Amino acid sequence: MIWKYLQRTNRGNIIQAGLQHRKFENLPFKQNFDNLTKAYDLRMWYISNSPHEAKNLEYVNELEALHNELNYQNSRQFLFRTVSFLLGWALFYQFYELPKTYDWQDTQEPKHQVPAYGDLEEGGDE
Amino acid sequence: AQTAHQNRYQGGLCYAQCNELFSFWNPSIQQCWKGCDFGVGRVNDPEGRIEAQQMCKRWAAELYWTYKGELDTIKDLRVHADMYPTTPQNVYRACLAGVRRQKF
Amino acid sequence: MEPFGTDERNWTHEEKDIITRFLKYDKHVNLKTAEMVYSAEVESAYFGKAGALAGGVISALFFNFPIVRNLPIIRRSVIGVLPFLYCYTWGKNTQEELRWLKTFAAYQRFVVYHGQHCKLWV
Amino acid sequence: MLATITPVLGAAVIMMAFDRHWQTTFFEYAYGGDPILSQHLFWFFGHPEVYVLIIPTFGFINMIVPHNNTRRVASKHHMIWAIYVMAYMGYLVWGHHMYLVGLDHRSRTMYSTIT
Amino acid sequence: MFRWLFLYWYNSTDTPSAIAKVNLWSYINLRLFKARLSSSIAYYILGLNNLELKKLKIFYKNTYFDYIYLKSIPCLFLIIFFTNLYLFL
Amino acid sequence: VFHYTNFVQETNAWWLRRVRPVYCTVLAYYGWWLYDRYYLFGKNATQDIRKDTTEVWEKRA
Amino acid sequence: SWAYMYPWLKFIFRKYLDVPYYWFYLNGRELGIRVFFTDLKLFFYGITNR
Amino acid sequence: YELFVDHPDLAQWTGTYPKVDSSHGFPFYSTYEMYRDFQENTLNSDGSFAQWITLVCGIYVIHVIYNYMIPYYWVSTPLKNDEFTRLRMKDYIASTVLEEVYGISYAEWG
Amino acid sequence: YKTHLFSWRWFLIKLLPSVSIILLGYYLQLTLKWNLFNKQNTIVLLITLLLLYILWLEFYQFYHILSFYGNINWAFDYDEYIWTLELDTRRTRLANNYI
Amino acid sequence: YEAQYACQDDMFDFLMELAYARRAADNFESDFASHELTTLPTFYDTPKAAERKTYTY
Amino acid sequence: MDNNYHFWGNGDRQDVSLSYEDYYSILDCLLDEKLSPQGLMKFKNLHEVSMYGVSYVPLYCFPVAYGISHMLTGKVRRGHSGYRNLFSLMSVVLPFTCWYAYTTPIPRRLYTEIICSNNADGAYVRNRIKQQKPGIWRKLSQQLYNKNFRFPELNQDLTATEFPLDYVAPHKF
Amino acid sequence: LFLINNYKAYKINTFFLYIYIYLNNLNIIWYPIFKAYSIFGYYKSTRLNFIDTKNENIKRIKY
Amino acid sequence: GFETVVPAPPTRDDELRMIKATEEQFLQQPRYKLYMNEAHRIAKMNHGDRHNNIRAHFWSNFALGLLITGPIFIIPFGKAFRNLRSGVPYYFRPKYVFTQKNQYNQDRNWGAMKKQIPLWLGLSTAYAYWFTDFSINDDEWLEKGKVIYPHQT
Amino acid sequence: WCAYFVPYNIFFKTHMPLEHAYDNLFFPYFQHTHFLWDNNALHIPTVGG
Ligand SMILES: CCCCCCCCCCCCCCCCCC(=O)OC[C@H](COP(=O)([O-])OCC(O)COP(=O)([O-])OC[C@@H](COC(=O)CCCCCCCCCCCCCCCCC)OC(=O)CCCCCCCCCCCCCCCCC)OC(=O)CCCCCCCCCCCCCCCCC
Ligand SMILES: CCCCCCCCCCCCCCCCCC(=O)OC[C@H](COP(=O)([O-])OCC(O)COP(=O)([O-])OC[C@@H](COC(=O)CCCCCCCCCCCCCCCCC)OC(=O)CCCCCCCCCCCCCCCCC)OC(=O)CCCCCCCCCCCCCCCCC
Ligand SMILES: CCCCCCCCCCCCCCCCCC(=O)OC[C@H](COP(=O)([O-])OCC(O)COP(=O)([O-])OC[C@@H](COC(=O)CCCCCCCCCCCCCCCCC)OC(=O)CCCCCCCCCCCCCCCCC)OC(=O)CCCCCCCCCCCCCCCCC
Ligand SMILES: CCCCCCCCCCCCCCCCCC(=O)OC[C@H](COP(=O)([O-])OCC(O)COP(=O)([O-])OC[C@@H](COC(=O)CCCCCCCCCCCCCCCCC)OC(=O)CCCCCCCCCCCCCCCCC)OC(=O)CCCCCCCCCCCCCCCCC
Ligand SMILES: CCCCCCCCCCCCCCCCCC(=O)OC[C@H](COP(=O)([O-])OCC[N+](C)(C)C)OC(=O)CCCCCCCCCCCCCCCCC
Ligand SMILES: CCCCCCCCCCCCCCCCCC(=O)OC[C@H](COP(=O)([O-])OCC[N+](C)(C)C)OC(=O)CCCCCCCCCCCCCCCCC
Ligand SMILES: CCCCCCCCCCCCCCCCCC(=O)OC[C@H](COP(=O)([O-])OCC[N+](C)(C)C)OC(=O)CCCCCCCCCCCCCCCCC
Ligand SMILES: COC1=C(OC)C(=O)C(C/C=C(/C)CC/C=C(\C)CC/C=C(\C)CC/C=C(\C)CC/C=C(\C)CC/C=C(\C)CC/C=C(/C)CCC=C(C)C)=C(C)C1=O
Ligand SMILES: [Cu+2]
């Protein structure tokens, strides 16, 4: 019965997937990013898979407005999250004891700070 | 350069044996080839082998400055892969190895 | 001549004071290092009081500023003293930073001079 | 070619100016400087410079001869490819001006062979 | 909405001369998106009476990993068998 | 048309199909000969020495 | 602005340069991908323990 | 053909000819000039000799790299064991190139 | 042993202002579609102040780097018991000069 | 004598100044060397070099 | 439990765990003249493994930093359009993830062999870490005591006649 | 299956499912088009499969 | 460690026996294996044989991993491309080229493939490296670099 | 305060660099000097503007 599990493919792996009804059964009463993107995806899929020109063009018109609204929502999200990240970074480095006890050997060049070759550098003349 | 053949392939099995004995970057292969050339026509004779050994002694002495008794007092005459002809003892050992490898 | 790494302990105030006093008044140190430490001290002493005076002036102005003046005394004094606190802490911090940086440079010079670093040689 | 080579000459000349004025010791052997680096950087542009000077001269003849001969030029594609090969192979022969400077025999032989 | 250039240019009623009467030019009627050919090779050959268009479609573009793995199983088994033969050799 | 190829077929196809194989195979055999000569020196020397008789080798020595 | 961080690139990619050719027979080992797949497991265990 | 129809700019960059046929008489709406440098400056085209010379130079440069550049980084610090052997190993491949070694066998030429 | 490794814990804090500026610029670009000039002057002024701060930091670092090459020291003449200012050139690793 | 042959007089003087400084400091390379812990392993680094070496006639 | 437990670069769940930063710090306070050839070979193998491991660490951290940067940017995935912001913000997020990964210690057979060896090399390395790297040695000794390793250098030694040189963290007796 | 159905009614059993559903609902993402052609261009691109059914593509000889 | 007894120099008969042994080894050397005549030739050939055995085992494990991980990971992983996170079925989301995907499920299938194939290969190679043993050609102390001469074998 | 007072005191009233001036550099420690740089006085228009 190995073929029944290897060579037999699930119906969902071949047939086109349907619409997840539970995603739309109950929705919040807020015209928020989730609802806006759900509507955008619905209209986009309908445009992709539909032969009706009259409904697609109006769907395109509505989808442009949906894109603008989603851009506004994303701008708000970006502002809030970026400000929070910057403030958290600043507070972390304000309250974090930065290690100031690293090795300083690199900054020292004993042979260069005090020229080891002395006067022999200038010409030689021996 | 100082061997008897314009290339190592013209030399018989002795050159291949020298190449196997020494590493590819070890220049003692040339001394082993010199030992092969010295032993050509002498290894198959009890006196010829000793004559070839004396030829190796002379070759080492002419290649490097040496004192009387060093080659006689060499402790180990065996040779390893990473032995280089930087001393008369090493040159003599490589030449002896080539003489031993030489068949005809 | 001290532990290095993130897990180590940063310089303490007592340790810094002891090290700077050692550099100032020790015999094994060199005249150039001693002069460096003295110059650090003299050239850093200024900021501590400069910042305090600037903060005092700015706080005197901010006490009579347009909104602080009309605010009640409880809010007025607290708001008007903020510039003074900021300037005072800035002056003290910059004084300490300059003095400690130059003293640490002098300590490095001393360590190199006496060969007390395991990875430094001519 | 000029676009490819100009930054190298600019960097070399800037390093020369820094050595002269600030004494950066880029070309001072005492503390890591490489006097031969200056020659390398200069000639890397210098040979393409002379190639740039010469290459345009061929076009004058290549245009004039057909015009006066009332005939198409001979193997225009091959001439174009030859000038291109010269242009983009002159970047590996800058050391023929530095044979005797003391560079390694490997680089010397490569430069001579490409030249 | 046209797929073929000849059908697109045969009878055009939205030309600038016709549209100038109403003086309305919608953005949805751009020549850039007006026509677009299919992605499959199509070439003309001489027929019995006129040129005829033949389409050269070689392979599909919607195969899935399950089918690919089923087709690849024999190659994997052959690799394993050859490796085992080498080991036993 | 779909068959328009960006290749200059004037004598190039014939060259690549007739002249290229000959000298390319000659070069391949020459390179293989060099590789074998350089890397299998011991085997070649042993085969050469075993091809001939002991007496002739003694005469050559 | 990251111009002066080239020492880290050098520290990473100089140890790759110093590796000799495999068939020169100096160490006869190549553990790049092996070390990659082993360090995946090692980091998993380390994070879980931490 | 799919590349030409969908992404004409990439087709032109790669050097593909217009794959559509205009036998019907109406020219295509995305035709472009042919950029044939890749297919012309090749060993199989008019740039055959230039590409042969460039290939020879590239092989020579690759050999030079393999002998002189990569080995230079193998050893950069003092070595405790067999330092001289390990240095000579890398020096041999560079100092023994046939370029400046071969020729004595045919010295009679000069 | 001269590896010249700088601490990332120190590098990130220095790098913060530039990423802050670029993020604010992107936000301004995105919001320009539905905002007015007067409202966005806040973001413009914030970007300007951050740019001024970064300019001051860059200038301070550049001034330190350029002043390195002037080696000024105090030398104590014991016979006169006087400190004198002396100027001299610098010798260091060429990597420092290149950077 | 090998170093003298390989070095010109000026470079030899530079190295002699370095040698004088190092001797005055009393510095040995062994007490400063720690790069072996970072150098890659090799067959020559085996803990038994005498056994690693093979001798034959 | 992979099929390469023999491999020196490999490790086990309960093997001694050492961070990359700790390893590099320990490399600083060691001298090769004072180590046996076997110890030198062990250190060379450890460096051979670390050469690849350190370079791979950012590769491991990349997906986490990429996801964090996407979340910071928002709930919109715009592909090439958002690369500028994604990689400008990720240029600081990824260093944080690499910091966490490097601070995270990982077990290794070479680490346990080098630290817990009962020979002169093991004693030397332990004493050097104890003296010149007290901060690292404190954590290392806590880990060893928790993993039931007993050495005279450990601060948690209950049979020692000399007082410890570092604070002893709480632990179960 | 019977055991799962029997335990379905329990609120404690449904708490984990509710948490999973909430996490899934907090996972939405948007995929905008970042090309100038935009939505109309995408629509025209997708319209390939239905052009043959339009009136303008019906055979109608002028003569 | 201790040193063994050094034999006296070989006689002519011993030299001839060594020459014969070297000739036999050279003859036994395979024709298709290109190894240069050097002190490390035999060690290199042994290392190559061990590497070939490891290669065989690794490729067998890789093929087995490709066979196994497919139905277990990649195919179930492709079920995540059935619908978007919003619940709508998969639809094409062009980047810069508005490719025509009229073919049934062309967009979904190609999008799933672009992630499944790299995942398939990565999982297969991880399986191979996990279940393949390198013990045969692993030398922690690098003691297998000792030179072996043809006559010794 | 930020743009004129603090920079003035940190630049002219002290020759000692701040930590952030050189913590990322690998030069040895050294002091500043306003009278041994930019002889052309090209920084005056820059600061003024
Ligand atoms: C993208 C869409 C999806 C489809 C594609 C898939 C994804 C893209 C990548 C695919 C291509 C990868 C490259 C080719 C590999 C296969 C080649 C082949 O079949 O020829 C036989 C060839 C030799 O095989 P073998 O001798 O039998 O060895 C197997 C034995 O078991 C012995 O095992 P071993 O552990 O000892 O390893 C052996 C190997 C080990 O060698 C090494 O040690 C090399 C690696 C060292 C470590 C990495 C260093 C570089 C990266 C540093 C990163 C630094 C980051 C920055 C850090 C700081 C800043 C943050 O050494 C050798 O045997 C000698 C040859 C070494 C050649 C290495 C170079 C290969 C690439 C170049 C030639 C091919 C063209 C590639 C074109 C470009 C592809 C992208 O295969 C190998 O290269 C070795 C096996 C590799 C693993 C299996 C790969 C299966 C293929 C699918 C892999 C899918 C990706 C996941 C793995 C990652 C890539 C490996
Ligand atoms: C390593 C250095 C790294 C530096 C990194 C710097 C990073 C910062 C970069 C900033 C700058 C970016 C912009 C660069 C612009 C450069 C100038 C330019 O052309 O711009 C045009 C650009 C636009 O002007 P345009 O006239 O429209 O440009 C037309 C194109 O450039 C088209 O020009 P074209 O019409 O002249 O086209 C010529 C091309 C056209 O011909 C072709 O199509 C090439 C041939 C293809 C077919 C070959 C087939 C061969 C047969 C098959 C293989 C046989 C071998 C065996 C295998 C097969 C067996 C069957 O053919 C060639 O000349 C190429 C040589 C072909 C030989 C192939 C040999 C292969 C052997 C393999 C080893 C050797 C490989 C060498 C490289 C090969 C080429 C990639 O200029 C501007 O926009 C204004 C100027 C802007 C300047 C900006 C600043 C530049 C700074 C550069 C600094 C460089 C520093 C280092 C220099 C020294 C390096 C050694
Ligand atoms: C009168 C007025 C009244 C007003 C009233 C007003 C009232 C207001 C009320 C309040 C209203 C506001 C309420 C606000 C609520 C806010 C909160 C909220 O709702 O949630 C927001 C928010 C919802 O999400 P979102 O931000 O909206 O974004 C959703 C997007 O859809 C997300 O999109 P995405 O899927 O693209 O996400 C990217 C994602 C992923 O991105 C990626 O990186 C993936 C894709 C990368 C692609 C490019 C690279 C690919 C390279 C190849 C990768 C191959 C795989 C293998 C690689 C190996 C290494 C090479 O990135 C990450 O996850 C990054 C962090 C990863 C952390 C480490 C892994 C965590 C999971 C571990 C699972 C372990 C399972 C063990 C099972 C054991 C079973 C025995 O909540 C969160 O997401 C919170 C997450 C916080 C971080 C959690 C970190 C957990 C770390 C766990 C570590 C465990 C270690 C030990 C494991 C031991 C195992 C044995
Ligand atoms: C003689 C040499 C120069 C000496 C200058 C001395 C200092 C003077 C400072 C004056 C500042 C402006 C004051 C304006 C007040 C009035 C405003 C007004 O009514 O609005 C109208 C209008 C501005 O209208 P607005 O509505 O206020 O504009 C608002 C805009 O947002 C604002 O936009 P905008 O108007 O600025 O637009 C012009 C735009 C175009 O840009 C410019 O205008 C360029 C400005 C360059 C200034 C360079 C100054 C150099 C000298 C410094 C000081 C020298 C020593 C002074 C004495 C010692 C100290 C006391 O400016 C920019 O965007 C520049 C960007 C920032 C660059 C800052 C400077 C460069 C920094 C980086 C490089 C620094 C290092 C050097 C690198 C190069 C090395 C080769 O102003 C004018 O048209 C000019 C003034 C009125 C007309 C002239 C009336 C008098 C007749 C001319 C007498 C002088 C010439 C003839 C002499 C012979 C007579 C017989
Ligand atoms: C399809 C035909 C194929 C024919 C087979 C040959 C071509 C194979 C593909 C190209 C690579 C050729 C590399 C040859 C050399 C490899 C070894 C090596 O570099 O060392 C030996 C030599 C180096 O020898 P060496 O001096 O290092 O000697 C080593 C030994 N000791 C140390 C003892 C001295 O290589 C060179 O000299 C390279 C010089 C650079 C130019 C080489 C050009 C070769 C001839 C032209 C070939 C063109 C082929 C075109 C094919 C396609 C078109 C038809
Ligand atoms: C106190 C309450 C009453 C109301 C207060 C009103 C706020 C006044 C804010 C003044 C801002 C001045 C900006 C100066 C820009 C130039 C800085 C420069 O060149 O650096 C010199 C000096 C720095 O010189 P430095 O060389 O010593 O740098 C020190 C470097 N570190 C930090 C690493 C030690 O600047 C500073 O000291 C701080 C500069 C901060 C710049 C921040 C810019 C963006 C934000 C501006 C503030 C916005 C506040 C809005 C109101 C909020 C009210 C709650
Ligand atoms: C130019 C921009 C557009 C083109 C981009 C490409 C340009 C690339 C140019 C460089 C190429 C590479 C060569 C590098 C040469 C470097 C030379 C060099 O270092 O010279 C520097 C020179 C110094 O050279 P120097 O020769 O005097 O150096 C002294 C060294 N010794 C003693 C050894 C000779 O400095 C200047 O040119 C002056 C710069 C002044 C900058 C002033 C900035 C003021 C900022 C104010 C705002 C901040 C807050 C405070 C505001 C206060 C308001 C009251
Ligand atoms: C130390 O540990 C180890 C390692 O180091 C970490 C190793 O590397 C290895 C190496 C070997 C390996 C094989 C690597 C192991 C790697 C692992 C396990 C991680 C990788 C795992 C994966 C890639 C699998 C990921 C896939 C999934 C989780 C499946 C996801 C499936 C989903 C979401 C199903 C979604 C489907 C649906 C909801 C159905 C929708 C159906 C419809 C009809 C649509 C709706 C329609 C209507 C109408 C309602 C080993 C063995 C190891 O043990
Ligand atoms: Cu020239």
Automatic annotation (TrEMBL), chain B:
Disulfide bonds join 14-36, 18-32, 56-95. ATP binds at residues 80, 84, 86, 90, 93. Keywords: ATP-binding, Nucleotide-binding. This is Uncharacterized protein. It comes from Tetrahymena thermophila (strain SB210).
Automatic annotation (TrEMBL), chain D:
It is found in: Membrane; Mitochondrion inner membrane. Signal peptide: none annotated. The chain crosses the membrane at residues 1-18, 50-67, 79-99. Fe(II)-heme a 4 binds at residue 51. Coiled coil: none annotated. It comes from the Eukaryota. Cu(2+) binds at residues 47, 96-97. Fe(II)-heme a 8 binds at residues 51, 97. Belongs to the heme-copper respiratory oxidase family. Component of the cytochrome c oxidase, the last enzyme in the mitochondrial electron transport chain which drives oxidative phosphorylation. The respiratory chain contains 3 multisubunit complexes succinate dehydrogenase (complex II, CII), ubiquinol-cytochrome c oxidoreductase (cytochrome b-c1 complex, complex III, CIII) and cytochrome c oxidase (complex IV, CIV), that cooperate to transfer electrons derived from NADH and succinate to molecular oxygen, creating an electrochemical gradient over the inner membrane that drives transmembrane transport and the ATP synthase. This is Cytochrome c oxidase subunit 1. It comes from Tetrahymena thermophila. The lineage of its organism: Eukaryota, Sar, Alveolata, Ciliophora, Intramacronucleata. The gene is cox1.
Automatic annotation (TrEMBL), chain H:
Zn(2+) 2 binds at residues 7, 9. The chain crosses the membrane at residues 49-70. Zn(2+) 1 binds at residue 7. Keywords: Membrane, Metal-binding, Transmembrane, Transmembrane helix, Zinc. This is Transmembrane protein, putative. It comes from Tetrahymena thermophila (strain SB210). The lineage of its organism: Eukaryota, Sar, Alveolata, Ciliophora, Intramacronucleata. The chain holds residues 56 to 165 of 220 of the full protein.
UniProtKB/TrEMBL annotation, chain J:
Keywords: ATP-binding, Nucleotide-binding. ATP binds at residues 53, 55. It comes from the Eukaryota. This is Uncharacterized protein. The chain holds residues 174 to 230 of 230 of the full protein.
